[PDB]
């Protein structure tokens, strides 16, 4: 029956990977819901790992893959729990870094696929930092 392996890294990655598949079709709502359940249904360690896999999608050279993550980032935050919110803010540079993501004019679609990424990034920061007011440590 049971047997070891190098680590439970596949379970976590599989979820994010499937909602960030290399397809232009918008990821189905039902798959997003499952992540939002697993997030609260798991310990905060899993929420940290989830965040890492999300970030690894911004690195994918494809424009589409980035956008898929951008919408998930905002769909997930605001429901999955507050832990994912704080951890996502810590690595939010990736989203801001896309406000000017021109990529390359895809010969097929005509610099369209890359808009989507950049567009969603603005909406995504508004979800990570979905805080009207806040606080922070003293400068001295």
Can you give the CATH number for the domain in which 108 is found? 1.25.40.90
Burial code of 102-129, b = ≥16 C-beta within 10 A, e = fewer? Answer: ebeeeeeeeeebbebbbebbeebbebbe
Whole-number Å distance between alpha carbons of 66 and 89: 17
H/E element, 36: helix 29-41
Q: How many CA atoms lie within 13 A of 87 on its CB side?
A: 21
CB 76 within 8 A of CB 36: yes
Phi/psi for 121 (5° steps) reads: -50, -40
Our count of domains for the chain comes to 1
CB 34 within 8 A of CB 18: no
**Which experimental approach was used here?**
NMR
CB 120 within 8 A of CB 70: yes
Q: By residue range, what is the domain housing residue 7?
A: 1-140
Phi/psi for 137 (5° steps) reads: -65, 160
Give the pair of three-digit tokens for residue 136. Answer: 């922070």
């Amino acid at each position: 029956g049971s047997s070891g392996s190098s680590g439970e890294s596949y379970w976590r990655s599989r979820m994010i990977d499937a909602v960030t598949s290399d397809e232009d079709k918008v990821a189905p709502v039902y798959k997003l819901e499952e992540i939002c359940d697993l997030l609260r249904s798991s310990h905060v360690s899993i929420v940290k790992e989830f965040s890492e896999f999300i970030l690894k999608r911004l690195d994918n050279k494809s424009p589409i893959v980035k956008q898929k993550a951008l919408r998930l980032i905002k769909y997930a935050v605001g429901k999955s729990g507050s832990e994912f919110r704080r951890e996502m803010q810590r690595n939010s540079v990736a989203v801001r870094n896309l406000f000017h993501y021109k990529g390359h004019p895809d010969p097929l679609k005509g610099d369209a696929l890359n808009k989507a990424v950049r567009e969603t990034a603005h909406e995504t920061i508004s979800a990570i930092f979905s805080e009207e007011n806040g606080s922070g440590p003293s400068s001295g």
